[PDB]
Amino acid sequence: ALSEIETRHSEIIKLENSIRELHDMFMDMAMLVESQGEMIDRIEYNVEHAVDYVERAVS
């Protein structure tokens, strides 16, 4: 009974480590992507000015 629970417990910990690392990746992904999203906002704002300037010049 003890030897089985012992070996089972070990596999639980293995599973914990994986999930933990997986979780950390998911978090890093979100933060990293969120950061990138803000750089894109800039590029969009920047381009939209350039486009308006070009359109105004033709007119």
Binding site: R8, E11, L15, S18
Partner: protein, 35 residues
């Protein structure tokens, strides 16, 4: 026990997901370097 089989699956299931996320990290890092 039967519960060891049940557990063993999850272990392998998570391992897959990790490798998938890993590739996703690779891609987002490439996405970062382009922006």
């Amino acid at each position: 026990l039967g519960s060891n089989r049940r557990l063993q699956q999850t272990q392998a299931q998570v391992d897959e997901v990790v490798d998938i996320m890993r590739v996703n990290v690779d891609k987002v890092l490439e996405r970062d370097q382009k922006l």
